[model samples]
Each structure stands twice: as C-alpha cells, then as structure tokens.
Target chain A: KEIFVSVDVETSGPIPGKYSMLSIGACVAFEPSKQFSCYLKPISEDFIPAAMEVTGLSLEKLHVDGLDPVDAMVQFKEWINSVVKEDETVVFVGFNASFDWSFINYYFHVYLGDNPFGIAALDIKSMYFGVSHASWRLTRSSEIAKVVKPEDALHDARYQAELFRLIDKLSEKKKLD
Target chain B: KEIFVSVDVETSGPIPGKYSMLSIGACVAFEPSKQFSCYLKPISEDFIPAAMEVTGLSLEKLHVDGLDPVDAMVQFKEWINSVVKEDETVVFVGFNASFDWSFINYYFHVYLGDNPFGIAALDIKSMYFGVSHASWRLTRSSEIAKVVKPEDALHDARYQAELFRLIDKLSEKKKLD
Candidate 1:
C-alpha cells in the first residue's frame, strides 16, 4: 500500500457535522500521475458565513456544480484504495492535518461506511510542528512550500503535493521508518 | 511491563556530548514506588554561563557531590533493567522528549555501551499536548493540572510521574475498545 495520500478540502467551519465540506481536492504519488477532486453539495443550513466567505462556495453554486457526497466519497475512496496496499499504512497528508482530517474522516465514515485509509491520516503541519516540533507554527502553504522550495504552485495544489513529499522525505530522515 | 518512564536532565547546553547531564531524573510507571536520579560529573569542559545559572550546580558541587558517569550509568541501567518486564517497550518521557532523549540516548550508547531503554523516549509535555482532543495550547501543565496536577515543580521527577499518569489516562480515551 502507498504510505500517504495528500488531501485538501474547503469546509464550512471547525466542527464537521456542524459544517459543510465544500470542495475536496487530492493528489497521489507514483505511476501515471493520479489526482482527484470534487465539489460537495451542502446537505444542511449550518454553513458558517465566515467559512463561506473564505471558501467562496455558495449554496447556489453548490446546487449547480457539486456532486453528491456519497458519489464524491466513493470515487475518492476507490481511487485511493486502488493505489494503496492494505498492509501498508496510508496517511492522508494535508497542510493542516486538523481541518482536512476532520472533514475527510467525517466524509468517509458518513458516506463510504468504512475509511479506506483507516485512522492514519497525517498532517504535514503536525509533523513539522506538533509534539514540540517547531513546524506546528509554520503551516502557511507558502511558508511550508518555501521550506521545501518546490517549483510549482498552480493555485497551490502542486505546491501542496510537493510539501507532502518534502514532509515524507524529512520524516524518513528523522527515522520515521 | 511498564511502557513509559518520565525523564528529566539538567544540562550544560544543547546536544548531548557538548553539554553534560548535571543531574538526571526519572520516575517509573508500573513500579509506582520506584524513582531514579543522579548527579554526573561533567565529561565536557565548555560550560556556558547561562547553563550554570539555570542548573545552579558549580564545579565545586561536582567536586564534592558527584557520581562517576560510569557508576551512575551502571546504577541507572541496573534500576531500569530490573523493572523491565517481559514484552515491555521502554520509552523515555520528559518535559521535552527530543532534547532530553538526545542527551540520555547519547549517554547510554557513548558512555555506558548499552541502551537501558530501547528505541525512542516519550515526552510528557508532547503526550500531554499531542494525544489530547482539546486545543493543543490548553495541554499545558497548569491548565491540565486543573483536572490533574503534578505533585511539584515542572521538572521534578515525581511530578512528571503524575503528569504521565494523567496523559496515559486521556490518551487511552482517544481510542474505542
């Protein structure tokens, strides 16, 4: 199984059930260059206005452009499951493991009924900073990207992918074997 | 077997070899009555003034009341090995696991020719902050101790024991058996 799958999502707020998963984005490592993304339709009125302002997704936009959460989750899961080996641990790497992990974890359990990646989603933010490491404070995408100095941003997904790869490299160097 | 032991060391500076472990402290988990502490004579001569101010141990103190590094290590190893049970995974815990772990780890391998505790050491401060479900900032001892207090000063070996007990209690709460 592949060790990590990087993911990102625009959410309505901090809490999952209380918020909406607006748009999901992901990129995987290895052969043929696989990637996945989706806009999730809102199911509740609990959308936090501040979050909506940041994510730039509205109810009307979601109604016209988004897919069902179930379909989005299934496609994402199937793609992820296909790439990873079962015995190998899969970590969903994202800029902040917190925001992305909650949404992704909530989405998988609520929709797929089983999380293909299990409970091992990793936060590059946490890896860099959490547990008394200095990296916890240095989580801005641009900042982390600079630390790794990847060549691309392209609205930052590729930069994020590079950040994930950088964290993977550093984790290995720190005896994360 | 107890899986965790709290570690504390008064150091002369950063890194293990350059700075001497002025005093070492540890409290074992399973053996609630057991404790380990030692004052080691310096092997290195470059003592930064700031380190002396914080540790308050002078060369005179070392001259009058210090144990040979070899003897201290022998006692520490004997104490650690005696308490270790079948299948026990030894982890060193400290306020900052990485820094203290570095010094202790280096001492055991470099001076003692053996590692009494294998692999990596645990950090109580990290575990207190890391495994918690609440805000990481709230994981500080004063905040957590409102729910569970350490018995003494921040690095007191006995107090660290209390902190670890609380951490292990809540860390288990994150899992569903």
Candidate 2:
C-alpha cells in the first residue's frame, strides 16, 4: 500500500539550489495528528525580497533557531519510516507538489544520500481537478475549499495535511458515486 | 471547460534556464488529430550528452532545421489559441508535468510574453494514482498501461495524449461506476 503524507515547505525563492528551503511541515494524511515540522539553517545566505517578505521568515532568525540541513533531513526520514510500516510506501503529497518537492528533493539529496519518498509525489490540485471535473485553473485551494466543505501554514504543514486528508476523502467519496 | 493538451518535450537537461528544451510535441487530448510538434534551435550552445543520446536528436542537426526559439513560442501559442476555444482553458498535461512545464513556461515568457496555459497543469501520473487506487509508485506507464489495457512516441506526444485521454476517461469511468 502507498500512504500519502502531506508535506509543505517555506522557501527563500522560487526554485531550490539558488533559493533555500527554510522550513518543512509534514503530516500523515490518514492521521493528521502524526506530523513532522522543521526549520533548516540556510544552506547559503541567498534570499529574494519577495520570498522573505511573503513568508515573514528571516535567515538571521533561523540561523539561531534552525537545525542543520543534514539533521533535519535525517529526523524527517526517520519520522517517515516510523509512521509508515516496513511493507508500506510513503508518498510525498502537496498542493502543487513540484514547488515543494523540488526543495525537499534537493535538500534530501544534498544533505542525505537520497529521498525516502522516491518518485511518488502527488499533487492535490491534480487530484481535485480529476475529482471535481472542474477547470484546471479552478483547482486552487480557495476554489477547492468551496467544493469540499472542509479544509494552513509555512504556507502550515498540518493545516495543509487537513486539506490533503479532506481532499483524499472527497476523492474516495467520488470513487463510491 | 478545461481542455487537456498532452505535451511532451525533449530537453538538454533536467531544469529549464540552466539547460535548453530541444523540442516540443503536443496534441489535444479530446482530438489527438490536432497536433503541434516543433524543434527549437538551442538558445545557447549548451547541451548534455545524455539528453542528446536519449532522444537521438542532435543540436547541430537542429541548428540548421530547427525553428528559432521566438518563432517556436509564437507558433506554439498561436496553435494553442487556435485549437482551444476562447472560453475554454488549456491545461498542460505531461507524464511528470513540472519538468516539461518549466521549459515551456520559461520559453514562453522569455521569448514571447506569458504562458498561454497559465497555472493550469494536469499530471498524468498523479491522475492515474488517484483513479487506480494503487500505490503511487505503481502509477508509471508500464503499470498503468496494464490497468487501462489501452495506450507513444518523443518519450511521444500523441501517445501521451492517448494515455491522458485513457486515464481521464478511466477516472471519469470510476466516477460513474
């Protein structure tokens, strides 16, 4: 079986490498209470005006409070392995997925040896697009929220988990008719 | 309604900006007969040997026969505008969407002005994952092909359109079952 884990990130800019993944918030979609959240010390001093402004996060502040990238990834991998059974797989799920997965994928490969989640990243928007039969542009959370009648952070990892679980269920609801 | 355009690209390397998109093949999902395939001359002399080897396409060969990046983008945008109705939105569909989209989006904005598809992208693997109720890892084409019993060319754009349409119909099939 494949288990979906909703993972969200706050980054310093659009892509990874050039930008920094400042923080990560993750939670099991099936069991929202089981979660993982972390702040990584900046890999470099790189930052963009809009990135810092949007997240209200500071490298200087994170420098004092953050865990090293290696340790953060280690703890994350360990947490994921713990939540998912030996036979089960953990899928990295997110709203748009690519943006967050890019950062997480880069950090894990850079800090650790590889990504624990592998190639199974799922996009909630794609899921909603398929389920609601809505226009692709209408898959945003604001629009999806109206459909699910259920539902935040680092742009909130746990809040994202709630949204993910609700969507997962809604899709399941769709499977039944 | 949102129309899915199955897009496939042969590129020089993984990410856009750093590398170049060698070519693009796109077809409308609902009407695979409608197609747009173009080879773009390399923006710079940059290319990865593996990319060339995998696609068996040479930048040197394209330098003579390929469309200029500017005209390529213009023709692509115009083609997309022509196929999709004014009221309908274009949702870019790809096996792993981000990689292809990054290039198309960058080329469009850098050469033309903006992306014609906007924020709409539908991932084939993600869609299959939701519909199959299978492990996310098993959403690959080999596995999905078996499930659908229906199915390429450029990794192949029309083939991808067929896959997208099959998966889209399968999901719609599950919705009605």
Candidate 3:
C-alpha cells in the first residue's frame, strides 16, 4: 500500500543553510483532517527580506515562539509514523517539490538522522502537468488554483492535501469522460 | 485537429544570450518522420565547453555550415506552417521543454518576429509524470526510455515525437482496457 503525504514548508529563502525553514505543514492526501504542522526557530540570523515579507513571518517572533529544529523534526516524524501503517510506503508529495523538499530532506537528515521520503518525492505540479495537459508555466499552484483549489501557517499544507486528492480525483473523472 | 510537434535543440550553453543554440531538430508526434532541423551560426562567442563536447559540434564548423539566425527562424516557422493545417493547433512538445523552448522562443521572436507555439509549450517530462504517477526524477527521458522506446542525427527529436504520441496514446489506450 502507498500513501501520499502532502507537505508544504515556509522557508526564509531558497536554499537550506543560508535560508531557514520557518514553518512546515503536512497532511495525508486522502485524509486532510489528519495533519501535522510546526514553526521552527530560525536556524540562521540571515534571511532574505522578500522571503520573510512573503511569509509574513518575523524571525524575531519565531526566536521566542518556535520549536527547536530537532524537536520539530521529531514531532513531524512521529506524526508521519502515527498516520502511516508499517507496511505502507509514504510518498512525500508537494506543490513545488524542489523548494519544499530541500528543507524537509535537509532537516530530516540533519536533525533526525534520516529522511522518510528517501531520494525522491512526488511533485503535484508535475502530476497536474500530465492531468491537465497544460503548458509548464500553467502548473503553478496559483494557476492550478483556478483549475482546482487549496491555507494559513498550516492552512496551505492541508489545502495542498486537498488539492492532491482532488486533482487525483480529477484524473479519474477525465478517464470517465 | 491538434498536432503535437516534438522539438529538440543542441545548444552551446544553458541560457540563450550567453550561449548559442547550435542546431534544432523537430517532427510531428504522430508522423515522427516529417521533420525540421537546422544549424544556427553562433550569435555569441560564449559556450560551455561541456555543451560543445556533448554536441560534438565545433563553432568553427557551424560558422561555416550554419544558417543565419533570421534565416533559421524563418525556415523553422515555415516548416511548422507546412506540417500543421490551418484548422489545427500546433502544440509545441519537447523533452525538458524549458531549455529547448527558450532557445526556440528567443530565436523565433528575435529573428522571425513570431512563435507558432505562442506563449507556452508542452514538456513530455511533465507529461510522463502524470502518465506514470512516478516520482519526479524517475520521469527523465532515460528513465522514460526504459519504460517506452525511440534514433539518429535527428533521432532523439523524432524519438521524442514518438514518445509524445505514445504517451498520449497511453491516455487513449485506456479507453478499451
């Protein structure tokens, strides 16, 4: 059996070291109500202003409010283990996987000593590219929203979960057509 | 009618301005035999040496043997016009489309003043992601080749054309199965 875990991370910037993953949200694609979310204390003092501005997150705020990276990852892994059965494979699915996954994969291995997603993960953008038969640029989540839909701190993750299942369902409907 | 045109380009480097697009190969996804190809005279002196070695093309050779950018674009547009009917839409298809499409899009707009494929193009890498339901990395052409099959001086483009149709056929094949 396989399960798609929709994950979304809000980071300070593009990469992992120079940029920090400030928050992460995740949920089962099939069960949106089952969710996981956490705000991480900024790992670096450095952050691109746009990343913070876009996230509407204050690193100063997280210094006091956020969980330590290690604790946050442990909770995340535990949450994953709780939802997924021992025999099932966990497929880490995200909107734009490269950006989101870099952080998750980095944090998982860096703090937790292992990554549950292994070497690769599922990208819903790639999935929609196939499903809609639309142009590459059109697969952006915002563009995808017009065609399907999704959030707050963890709102986007749950929303992403919803989008994954719906788009998957959309494929089934297309086949029915 | 919709015509999927598979396009592949050999370039001197990554981006258009810094690097040069050396040669282009294309064909109809359905036909795979009806083809278009041209070598362009290098517009810039810059080239990533790896790009040159991978292509086994010398800028010195292209400078002697190639068409001018304007002439190349004109022929490309003309070839597209000849293959696609007035009522049919020309869907630009390619493997790793962003790289190949950028050179084509830039050349068409810069020289010929028009791009038949318009603002966007289809990427078969994206297409196969939807078809295979595989992780993003697994959708690579080499990987897709293992799952499906392709040729020559213009072989990869023609093979890519076949891939576009065969993968599209995969969607259609489900009709009876």
Candidate 4:
C-alpha cells in the first residue's frame, strides 16, 4: 500500500546547507486533515532578505522558539510513520518537488542520517503537466490555484501543504474522469 | 523561424536582488559554435560560501576584472540581437530554467530596464520529460549525460552554456524523429 504525503516547506533561502529550512508542513494527500508541522532552529546565518520579506517569518522569533534540527526530523519521521499503515509507503508530494525535496533531503540526511520518504518525489506541477499536457508556464501556483481553489496560500507551511494536497486531488480527479 | 538560445548563469547565491549574477553564458541551442560570455562585478555582499565553492569564482578577483552589471547585460543584449533575425524571437533555454531564469530576468530588469527573452523559458528537463514521459529523477544532468555527451562541465558559465545547448539539441532530435 502507498500513502501520498503532501509536503510544504518554508525556508530562509533557496538552497540548503547555505540557508535553512525554517518550517515544514505535511498532510496525507487525499485526506487534508491528517497533518504535521514543525519549525526548525536555523543552523546557517545565510538568507535572502527578499525571501524573508515574502515568508514574513522572523529569524529572531524562529531562533528563540523553533525546534532543534534533530528533534524536528525525528518528529517528521514519526509523523510519516503515524499517517501510514504497517505495510504502507509514503510518497512525498509537493508543488515543485525539486525545491522542497532539496531542503527536506538535506535536513533529513544531515540531521537524522536518513530520510523517511526515500529517493522519489511526486511533483504536483509535473502531475498537472502529465494530466493536462499544458505548457510549463501554466504549472505556476497562481495558475493552479484557479482550479484547486485552495484557501489563502499566504506563506504559512500548513496552508501551502493544503494547496499541494488540493492540487494532487484535483489532478487525480481529472485523471479518473 | 524561432531561435533557441541556450543560457547558463553562475551566481553569488541562489536568488537575485539579495545575491548577484557572477557570470553568464549563452549559445545558439542547435548551433553551439556561436556563443557569448560575460563576468560581472559583485553588486551585493551576499555570498553563499557553498555556491562560491562550486563556481570557484572569487568576488575579490571579480571586483577588479569583471564588467559592470549594466555593461555585461548590454553586451549580452547585443549578442542576442546579433544572432537572431529581426523577426525571429529567441527562446531562453536552460536545464532547470526556474533557477537560471530568476537571475537572468532579475538582472536584465534591474540593470538594463528590459529583458530580451520576455516571460517564457524553455526548460530542457521539462521538455525531456514531456518527450520521453520519464520520471523527474531521471532528468538530472548526470542521468541525461548518458544520452547527451556534454563535455566535462567545469562549472564555468561558458561550459554550462554549451552543455545546455547539447541537451536541447539531443532532446529535439529524439522528439522530432
């Protein structure tokens, strides 16, 4: 059996190692209610200020209040296990899996020594491309929001996770029909 | 007739504004012989040490030897104009266009007050996926290298431009025939 885990991450900057994964949110793709969220204490000082402005997550606040890196990864691993059955595997799903996957893979390996979701990631943007055969530009979240109808994806990790879930479900719905 | 321009850029950091484009390289996608290359002086103090390590470009050295941002962009603009016919538009092509496109678009607008490539970008990885119906994991340069024999990519801006041109040509050949 397989469970699709819709994941969204808020980061200090674009790449991992140089920057930091500030927060992460994930939910069972078909069931949006079963979810997890964690804020990781930053390990790097590097940040793109424009990203800081967009995320609106103060490094000072996260530094003081966020979970330790190892603790965050441990909890995320447990969350993945909790949401799936004994024989089940989790498929990491995100809007642009390349971006989120880079940070997630970096943190999980650097902190916990291994990743819960192995190797492959299901990208909703790619899935939409497969379903609609649309041009690459059409895969933008703004364009996808028109169809997914996600409520207010305003930088919060959980809201972004719901957006990923909605996108996957919408693509699945279209594939089925 | 439409012209494909394979573009590659090296940057101080991942995103623009806070970071800077250290260098850029471009070539005719199917015809790799015609090319342009430029290195820019650092505009921001922002540097991701990891990015600097990979690119092996020193901001201190570039400060003395590199072209002004406006000068570099003007030369690049001239290079594009010289290659394509007046009626033919050049499509910006890159491996992972989102990353390169962000820097290219930002620099062109910030320094030149206009962008020659407009809003569209032809992503070689996305194009490969569309043509081959392959999974995203298989789209990596290492994986694609098995099919398209790009010369040793030395992390130089010009070397990467040629690689992008090769990948685009290989995919087009497979896609057309």
Worst 10 residues of 3 chain B by lDDT: B168-177
Q: Which parts of model 1 have CA positions greater than 4 angstroms off? A: A1-177, B133-139, B150-155, B174-177
In angstroms, how far off is B3's CA in candidate 2? 3.2
Off by over 4 Å in 4: A1-177, B149-177
> Using lDDT as the measure, which candidate wins?
2
Error of 4 at A46 (Å): 26
User: Which of the two, 1 or 4, has more TM-score?
Assistant: 4
Q: Summarize candidate 2's per-residue lDDT along A117-157 as a digit string, tens digits.
A: 87446887887766665667678878878877773243356
Off by over 4 Å in 3: A1-129, A132-177, B149-153
lDDT of 4 by residue, B76-171 (tens): 999999999998877676666556766777677667766798755555565444434444566676776776677711133345455555644543
Weakest lDDT window of 10 consecutive positions for candidate 1 chain A:
A128-137
Candidate 3 per-residue lDDT, tens place, B1-177, comes to 668788888988765655688998988878877988888899889887877888999899899899998999988888999998998778777776655765777677567656788645666765676766555567767888787774222777887777777776675554335
Interface RMSD of each: 17.4, 2.9, 7.8, 7.8
lDDT per residue, candidate 2, B1-177, as tens digits? 777788988887655555678898988888888888889888767666776788888878888988999998999999999998988878788777755765776687577756788744677887776666566767777888888877322437777777877877887777667
Instruction: Report the C-alpha displacement of residue B167, candidate 4, in angstroms.
Output: 5.4
In terms of TM-score, the best-performing candidate is 2
DockQ of model 4 vs. true complex: 0.07
